[PDB]
Ligand binder design. Structure first.
Ligand SMILES: Nc1ncnc2c1ncn2[C@H]1C[C@H](O)[C@@H](COP(=O)(O)OP(=O)(O)OP(=O)(O)O)O1
Ligand SMILES: Nc1ncnc2c1ncn2[C@H]1C[C@H](O)[C@@H](COP(=O)(O)OP(=O)(O)OP(=O)(O)O)O1
Ligand SMILES: [Mg+2]
Ligand SMILES: [Mg+2]
Lengths: 129, 129
């Protein structure tokens, strides 16, 4: 379900050090209109079994850790905390294309694309493909 | 309407020699069910103006001359007469793909094609194109 590079991109020692920053007590601040769509389609789960394999608390820190892979190993640990505190306190909002597709093997994160076709059969076949 | 290679593929001298073999007196042997579809869609004509630019007599000799371009210039003149006598006496029949598309710039003469698509998105896009 995840991408096989996160564990190979960080250290086990600092992992537990950063782990003691995400007490799940803040998870009890949602609304029904939130958890509804969340369980519907926002997090990783098999679309045929619906066996959810994640938790709305590890979501934010997981995406914040994955987005900061290629960085110097001197400030990323103290830098991910700011983004986590921003996303957890609902100060910054993120779409489905970025929360429905993060840390996922299929690396696609755009939201809109444009295309125009002129008078040519080959162009029409190409834009159809 | 024609292809700009026939005149560059034969000689003007033998042209008139082969010309005295196609007295149009045999053109008065059709049926209404023939000329109907012929004027409908069998010979070269603009599909928006319907200004016909051919004649059902020059059709056979034109296609027989065009089909015999790449040949030694020693027997083609005496060889095209056999095919013309075959097609004019209705002994051999020819489809629209070969009579609707001969001596035409768009050189396409097949009649059927096959294609199969397996389980792949790229394959589907390719076969659609
Ligand atoms: N088989 C067809 N017959 C008539 N029009 C077609 C056909 N296929 C596609 N078209 C439409 C869409 C094409 O953009 C347009 C023809 O342009 P094109 O694809 O460049 O072929 P073409 O060069 O033979 O015609 P044109 O000279 O008008 O551009 O007409
Ligand atoms: N976006 C899609 N989601 C689900 N199925 C799709 C999708 N697009 C096409 N399909 C259908 C047609 C494809 O042949 C088939 C998936 O096979 P494929 O094109 O090879 O992609 P894939 O490798 O990611 O899936 P699979 O491993 O099952 O082959 O499912
Ligand atoms: Mg064109
Ligand atoms: Mg596949």
């Amino acid at each position: 379900k995840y991408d096989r590079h996160i564990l190979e991109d960080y250290s086990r020692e600092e992992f537990d050090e950063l782990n003691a920053y995400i007490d799940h007590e803040r998870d009890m601040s949602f609304s029904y209109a939130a958890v509804k769509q969340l369980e519907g389609k926002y997090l990783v789960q098999n679309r045929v079994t619906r066996q959810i394999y994640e938790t709305p608390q590890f979501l934010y820190v997981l995406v914040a850790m994955c987005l900061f892979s290629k960085y110097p190993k001197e400030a990323r640990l103290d830098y991910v905390k700011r983004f986590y505190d921003a996303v957890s306190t609902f100060k910054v909002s993120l779409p489905t294309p970025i929360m429905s597709g993060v840390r996922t093997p299929t690396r696609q994160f755009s939201s809109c694309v444009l295309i125009e076709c002129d008078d040519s059969l080959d162009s029409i076949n190409a834009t159809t493909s």
